Backbone:
């Protein structure tokens, strides 16, 4: 998380938590982005911790939604 | 210290520390027992020295370097194969399917699309290198050979040089890239940073950034070439990717280039002897092109008739009109006037 | 392997080792430059033996065993028509100091700074300069740089009891003290000595010093008894002191001089300014000498050295002061004693929810890394044979107790804290203790199974030193007494007099003033503070405390306050700490 | 700031560590047909004693002072002996000397001996033993 | 696991592992030999512990901190050199060129600009420190000397004190900077970054940032003045202009202030030794300020007594009152508690 914050940094954090490939889609008009990943082996507590990490890291004006694919 | 600690020294220290009444020298029972494990300790000291150089990132060899960089998130490049197009010569009607393997020297290449010799689509098929490496960048005029024999094919050769072959990133390159990335600090918010990244790219000498141009979360960037000229398409693309890899999440990005303006001129002038309309027209177009290159801001009418009168062959002129008027023409941003129509009447 | 290379003005470089006939390398302690002499064969009669020419003022480099020892300029060149030889003489860079001639005015300057300025004025590169905190004041008019530096360092040597020299090594200039490096090679009669000549002289003896004022009138005199014992006669010396200098007499005395002249075999490490060892044949005693002059020669495939040695003292048999490596008796966990040893039986434990009991005495989840165990605790499980005699003979443990467990396994042995609660954990009639070892998974416990071993309980002292108790008790004995600056007595104490008295009561002599007290004993850190330590806070130590542990310490605060106990954290100004017990 | 009192610049006084001679390598040669040997569409490189064989063959085959490109120490003088310009003993001694001196200029070659020498008909035969660092 | 193995444990294990009938005890051959070996044996474990502690750079300023920091990306300041200006007094017409060397005590200086004495350009020239350090920050009216004598120059003095000279960054400052960088969290446009931006501007003492207060693209910043009080309009304007200048492009930020509630605190309290009423009053002021900032709901009397008793220098207190009562007081909407009066007696 330290240093430059871009798309790939957030993807790296999300994969470091979810141990899987992550794809992000951005909504400029609605000020929203969604992270999609495969959660066939991901727990709820680790997902909550990842979301809290992202919220600490994410720019304040943006919305963040998670998309666990089962 | 670690280098000083050797079999002889540790053995002497061990023998001095042990307290018996027996004789301690070469060939003694106690000396025989003490030796044998001190040698292994001297061996162990060297690995103990080496472990620190193993651990760090300045000198990590290959796999430990990969692990330590993966900790931060950077990945070693896997390279790219070389891609090119060859020509097939032989019996007409012969069909070669995709997946066929061709070879030049010890290298191996694969055919991507089907080609029929003599077919109306042509006798050229793109070819991709099987492995990665710069050695796969074959030049022009390479005479290939089929790995698996196919009847009706006689000659395989390429008309354009193969390109795209790249090597795996060396340790020094990866370490330098990692240090470069980590040293830099970026706050992706302020507007001046967009101009900064746009200016970092090559071929740019001025940048303008437009906040809130196409609704919320939109940034438009106006890059310029040398002396406020229009940039090439490739420069626009490369700047686009640069700021894209340097931008945060959320704002959509568009980059454009200057768009020319149509300027039509007209005047009634008196010519000198030995000069025709074409000669004065060409000299005036040259001079006005230089002017339009050098002028910032709005156009100047009096400079226009000055550059017109100085044009050789003009004895007098009157009724000089620019775009239907004698007024100064304002030039907006990313706009460069061009001469469209010149109506000169003697 | 010796190599000689020559650099010529145009840019050419030659290796002339195959032409050299003879080489000599030498130095002396009374000159700043070393010298190199060599010869080559060049014949004018024979065309075959004509060689290259080496003009004056070209650089010559000398290598021995792939190491550069000399670099200098060519100064003299000579050619004899009868002999087919050309001779060269070369000099070190050190002669550049004596060319400079500047006038300086030095007031209260460090000698090192004086040398640095002299080297900087006439632009020269400095490798390293010996450090000495002695200030000098002098006026130099028309004096060399070499003489200036030597005079300043002699004045410093009057206090440091040392000798200094100037050495130009390659392109660097250095100032070093003589004898700091002692060579590994020793000269013995039966091994590597060709000849020696020992001498003793009385000519330059001085045993009386007379001081005169500026006027020339005598003010004081002194006689040295130790030198006068050796020589019955009195040989006087006269020195004059100006208004702003107070001379020290004891430096001017000079004794008998003892020397040696040695020729033998050695290495290229034996050069002027180093210490060497020579063994006496009759008594098998070893003496230390300082090298004053040296000369190395290579000729006809043989290499010999000649040294002029000055005797310092006899090397003490074994160790003079007997320096021992000061180590603690125990690296960690010191003063573990009283540890009665009991035979034990070890059982494996797995944290399983269905079985229950995963909570400890305080109902907290068990951590395998804690190395906690289940041991019989007072009031948990009592059988019929747990008699008072038996309990006194086999004591039951308490919660949180630290016991040492030896299961016979690498990693399963160590100190175990009694925290886990286990059903049927008791002591057998013979006295075997059931100790349950915690495990983090089923497999480890299944592998461990049930084994027999030994445990130790109730062994601990946790003390520092016997004198510390006397120290602390005396310091408490002086609590509440009125303060007095400069008072050393039971009636009143100042900040430092308290510990002066207190450590004098345990035969520990300390400096009277706490500032000097900071400069005694081993350094102590704030995290390594124990009972009896001394704590220093302000940069001037107006008040020093005696640390008694627990974040408290005893001291005399200041005038108007009385001796009390203060909390260490309340004194944010902590600077250093020392231990003298 | 500080003067440099020696001839040249500090760069000229850095001495590279002296090491053993690098491994001797040379393009392969075909003695029967007098041609270099190509392998897989390129020159073939051999190592150690085979390369020394190539070098020795080439050195023996050339004449000493005939070519301008070579120095005065490269080549042999065995052509002066053809036709019995000297007696048999003098020719034998001179042939031994010529071969030794011609071969010894290579730093990879330590010693040369010419041992057997026999005159049969119009042919002179000899045995040469060469000792190298390998 | 190195700390697990110690001298006694390994000694006992080795003496147990020998399956011999020889008696082992004090003053025994086998015991003495095993102890002599095991001392050198355990030295390696001690050195391994030191090696690991050196690897993670926790204490005692090990040399590998430089490499670990370079992994993280911090760098050490080389320092800054002093700049100044001097006046040359002397013969008219002399020329003092660039690079001229002037000396004060051991310090050395260099002239920057070609100055001519008695000319229309003035006799003052910039002067720069030739080495790094604070010792080159000279005071006013210092006399300088020319290392190389120039004819026609008599006096060199500075009309102002030299500035700009600082020493090299100490490793203490390096470690403190590394640790404070690690403690602080800064990211492009995140809430902590907004907190920092609001904290930069003078007149703001406490910051509260509310992402998405009016939907997407909105950030709310609440600033506080001294002692959790309302901020003035000029401070709000300066804070918002600074935020906008450093904010990203697209989000909208609004600055407001709350309504303070006057509270009165009275208590009879015995002070510890060495503490007067002023220090404890200030400490309780800060504590109650942070409580009022972190409180939600109603001011709880027991929490107030807890925050008062834990103040350093407090031993016992009695008859504590908030607004003259011990009852909880509701903090309504758009309202914040604020200390107006503090009444303490011993």
Residues:
């Amino acid at each position: 998380s330290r240093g430059t914050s871009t798309i790939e940094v957030i993807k790296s954090i999300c994969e470091a938590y979810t141990k899987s490939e992550t794809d992000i889609k951005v909504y400029s008009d609605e000020f929203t982005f969604v992270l999609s990943f495969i959660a066939n082996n991901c727990d709820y507590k680790t997902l909550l911790d990842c979301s809290d990490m992202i919220e600490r890291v994410k720019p304040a004006h943006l919305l963040h939604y998670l998309e666990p694919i089962i | 210290m670690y280098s000083d600690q050797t079999y002889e020294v540790i053995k002497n220290r061990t023998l001095e520390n042990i307290n018996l009444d027996i004789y301690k020298g070469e060939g003694s029972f106690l000396n025989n027992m003490v030796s044998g494990n001190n040698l292994e300790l001297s061996k162990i000291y060297l690995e103990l020295s080496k472990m620190h150089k193993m651990a760090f990132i300045q000198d990590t060899y290959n796999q430990f370097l990969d692990k330590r960089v993966n900790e931060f998130g950077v990945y070693r490049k896997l390279g790219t194969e070389s891609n090119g197009e060859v020509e097939f010569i032989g019996e007409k009607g012969t069909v070669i399917n995709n997946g066929t393997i061709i070879s030049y020297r010890d290298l191996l290449f694969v055919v991507i699309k089907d080609v029929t010799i003599g077919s109306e689509e042509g006798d050229n098929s793109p070819v991709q290198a099987l492995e990665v490496g710069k050695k796969y960048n074959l030049p022009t005029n390479c005479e290939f050979k089929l790995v698996d024999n196919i009847s009706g094919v006689t000659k395989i050769t390429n008309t354009r040089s193969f390109e795209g072959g790249t090597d795996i990133e060396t340790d020094e390159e990866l370490k330098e890239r990692f240090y470069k990335i980590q040293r830099n600090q970026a706050t992706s918010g302020n507007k001046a940073h967009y101009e900064e990244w746009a200016l970092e790219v090559d071929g740019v000498y001025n940048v303008k950034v437009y906040p809130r141009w196409d609704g919320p979360g939109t940034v438009k960037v106006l890059i310029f070439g040398k002396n406020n000229q229009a940039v090439d398409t490739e420069t626009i693309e490369r700047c686009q990717q640069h700021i894209d890899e340097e931008k945060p999440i959320g704002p959509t990005i568009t980059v454009v280039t200057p768009l020319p303006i149509e300027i039509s001129i007209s005047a009634v002038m008196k010519l000198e002897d030995g000069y025709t309309l074409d000669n004065v027209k060409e000299s005036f177009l040259e001079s006005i092109n230089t002017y339009f290159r050098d002028i910032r801001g709005e156009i100047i009418y009096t400079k226009v008739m000055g550059i017109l009168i100085n044009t050789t062959g003009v004895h007098d002129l009157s009724n000089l009109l620019i775009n239907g008027s004698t007024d100064n023409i304002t030039i907006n941003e990313d706009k460069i006037p061009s001469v469209t129509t010149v109506n000169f009447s003697e | 392997m010796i190599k000689i290379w020559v650099h010529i003005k145009n840019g050419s470089i030659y290796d002339i080792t195959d032409i050299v006939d003879k080489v000599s390398w030498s130095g002396d302690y009374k000159s700043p430059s070393r010298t190199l002499e060599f010869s080559i064969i060049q014949s004018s009669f024979d065309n075959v033996f004509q060689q290259i020419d080496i003009p004056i003022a070209s650089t010559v480099c000398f290598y021995v065993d792939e190491k550069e020892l000399f670099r200098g300029m060519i100064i003299n060149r000579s050619k004899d028509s009868s002999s087919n030889e050309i001779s060269f003489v070369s000099k070190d860079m050190g002669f550049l100091l004596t060319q400079s001639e500047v006038s300086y005015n030095f007031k209260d300057k460090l000698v090192e700074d004086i040398a640095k300025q002299v080297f900087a004025e006439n632009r020269l590169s400095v490798g390293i300069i010996a450090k000495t905190n002695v200030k000098y004041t002098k006026m130099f008019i028309g004096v060399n740089g070499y003489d200036t530096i030597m005079s300043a360092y002699t004045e410093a040597s009057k206090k440091t009891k040392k000798k200094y020299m100037i050495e130009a090594n390659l392109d660097k200039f250095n100032v070093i003290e003589k004898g700091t490096v002692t060579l590994s090679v020793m000269f013995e009669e039966g091994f590597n000595i060709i000849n020696t000549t020992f001498s003793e002289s009385m000519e330059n003896v001085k045993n009386k010093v007379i001081v005169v004022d500026q006027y020339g009138s005598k003010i004081s005199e002194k006689i040295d008894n130790e030198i006068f014992k050796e020589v019955n006669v009195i040989m006087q010396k006269v020195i004059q002191q100006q208004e702003n200098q107070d001379v020290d007499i004891d430096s001017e005395f000079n004794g008998i001089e003892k020397s040696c002249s040695l020729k033998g075999y050695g290495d290229v490490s034996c050069i002027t300014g180093r210490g060497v060892k020579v063994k006496d044949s009759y008594t098998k005693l070893v003496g230390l000498f300082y090298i004053d002059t040296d000369k190395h020669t290579w000729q006809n495939g043989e290499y010999q050295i000649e040294l002029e040695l000055n005797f310092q003292n006899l090397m003490d048999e074994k160790s003079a002061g007997q320096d021992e490596p000061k180590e603690e008796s125990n690296l960690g966990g010191e003063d573990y004693a009283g540890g009665k040893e009991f035979t034990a039986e070890f059982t494996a434990y797995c944290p399983r929810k269905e079985e229950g009991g995963d909570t400890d005495c305080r109902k907290k989840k068990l951590d395998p890394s804690k190395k906690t165990c289940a041991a019989p605790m007072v009031g948990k499980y009592e059988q019929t044979y747990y008699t008072k005699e038996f309990l006194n003979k086999h004591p039951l443990l308490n919660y949180g107790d630290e016991i040492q467990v030896i299961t016979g396994v690498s990693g399963r042995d160590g100190v175990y804290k009694v925290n886990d609660v286990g059903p049927a954990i008791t002591i057998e009639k013979n006295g075997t203790y059931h100790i349950d070892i915690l495990f983090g998974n089923v497999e480890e416990a299944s592998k461990f199974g049930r084994r027999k071993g030994k445990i130790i309980i109730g062994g601990y002292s946790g003390n520092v030193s016997d004198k510390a108790k006397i120290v602390i008790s005396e310091a408490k004995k002086h609590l509440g007494k009125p303060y007095k600056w400069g008072g050393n007595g039971p009636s009143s104490f100042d900040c430092s007099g308290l510990m002066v008295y207190c450590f004098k009561k345990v035969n520990v002599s300390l400096p009277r003033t706490s500032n000097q007290q900071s400069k005694k004993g081993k350094k102590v850190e704030q995290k390594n503070l124990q009972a009896g330590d001394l704590v220093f806070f302000h940069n001037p130590v107006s008040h020093v405390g005696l640390y008694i542990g627990n974040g408290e310490f005893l001291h005399a605060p200041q005038k108007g306050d009385v001796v009390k106990i203060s909390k260490l954290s309340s004194r944010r100004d902590f600077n250093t700490a020392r231990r003298v017990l | 700031s500080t003067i440099f009192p020696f001839i040249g610049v500090p760069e000229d006084y850095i001495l590279p560590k002296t090491e053993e001679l690098p491994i001797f390598r040379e393009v392969a040669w075909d003695f029967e047909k007098d041609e270099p040997i190509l392998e897989k569409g390129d020159f073939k490189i051999i190592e150690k004693k085979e390369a020394l064989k190539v070098w020795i063959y080439k050195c023996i085959k050339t004449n000493r002072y005939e070519h301008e490109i070579y120095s005065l120490e490269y080549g042999t003088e065995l052509s002066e002996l053809i036709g019995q310009k000297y007696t048999k003993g003098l020719t034998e001694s001179e042939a031994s000397r010529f071969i030794k001196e011609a071969l010894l200029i290579n730093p990879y070659i330590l010693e040369v001996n010419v041992k057997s020498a026999n005159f049969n008909r119009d042919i002179l035969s000899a045995n040469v033993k060469v000792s190298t660092i390998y």
